[PDB]
Design a protein around this nucleic acid. Structure first.
Ligand code: MG
Ligand code: MG
Ligand code: ZN
Ligand code: ZN
Ligand code: ZN
Ligand code: ZN
Lengths: 162, 162
DNA sequence: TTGACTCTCTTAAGAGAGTCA
DNA sequence: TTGACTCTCTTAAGAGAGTCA
């Protein structure tokens, strides 16, 4: 809600609730042939999810609180960043999973960045493979690699140059 | 169905027409601080676009040929790949701009791969900066870099560990 | 047969809001 | 007030198909 105090109270209640979500250990590629360990705090697969939480899509949730007799609702991963600018360079800020684990609500696994920055982490080589993200990746992106290209650049005639 | 000879004739007509598009020289980052040059064959901004071409969206076009009284139509960048498999690993193949220049129809700037592989090239460090794409990038992706993250991982209390 | 428009859809990273009990 | 559902929307890489002359 409006006041900084009210916002801090929302963040604190969210952290307390998410802090009781099951902690699931995931071993992850870091790049450079190395492996690390992340501890994700995973929202349950089915109701009940936790005080204030409800599922609005297959892997979408919202956090809800009643302040001054009014319901306030946010995307479930946006709550850590309620005191941050909601845009950057004219682009909407989004909650971005450094652990690439949607059900996870560990704020130590989230950052707040444009949708382009968010998406791009899927292909990052990782913190031990050359990540250049200023807010560093926690793991190599799940889609990093050579790809599976079916056909490369080609011409039948002689009209084109690279 | 069109014979493989009829399909080759469509690719040849397409190449003939695209080869007469304005050719624009672009200097581009290759990664590793090196600069290179790409020559894009750019479809016009407004009608007429060229024989067989029409705009179906702000940056979407289609190619159309009528053969034995049947109208055939294809996405304008898909024509080089009409003799290739159209899916891989259960994923639809898409035309993927190695030059990241949507108006370009140079087939030496296109490859044929899943939408995930396609998107991922936006963040590639480039052929002189560590590209691992098996079909190699022609340039550093336009979105490669440190990013512009507004807020990083953080907690107010002590409920979480990484 | 052709040109120049029109419309909606896919994907996978993300969102907002309403209906009931 | 709180819970458990319902619906559609955004973005930027990509698509298929209809109408009229
Ligand atoms: Mg993400
Ligand atoms: Mg692309
Ligand atoms: Zn996590
Ligand atoms: Zn990274
Ligand atoms: Zn090009
Ligand atoms: Zn590459």
């Amino acid at each position: 809600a409006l006041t900084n105090a009210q916002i801090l109270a929302v963040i604190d209640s969210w952290e307390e609730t998410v802090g009781q979500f099951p902690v699931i250990t995931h071993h992850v590629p870091l790049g450079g042939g190395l492996q690390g360990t992340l501890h994700c705090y995973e929202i349950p697969l089915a109701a009940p999810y936790g005080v204030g939480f409800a599922k609005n899509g297959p892997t979408r949730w919202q956090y809800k609180r009643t302040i001054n007799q009014v319901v306030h609702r946010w995307g479930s991963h946006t709550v850590p960043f309620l005191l941050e600018p909601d845009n950057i360079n004219g682009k909407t800020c989004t909650a971005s999973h450094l652990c690439h684990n949607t059900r996870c609500h560990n704020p130590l696994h989230l950052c707040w960045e444009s949708l382009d920055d968010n998406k791009g982490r899927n292909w990052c080589p990782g913190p031990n493979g050359g990540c250049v993200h200023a807010v560093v990746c926690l793991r190599q992106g799940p889609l990093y690699g050579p790809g599976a290209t079916v056909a490369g650049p080609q011409q039948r005639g002689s009209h084109f140059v690279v």
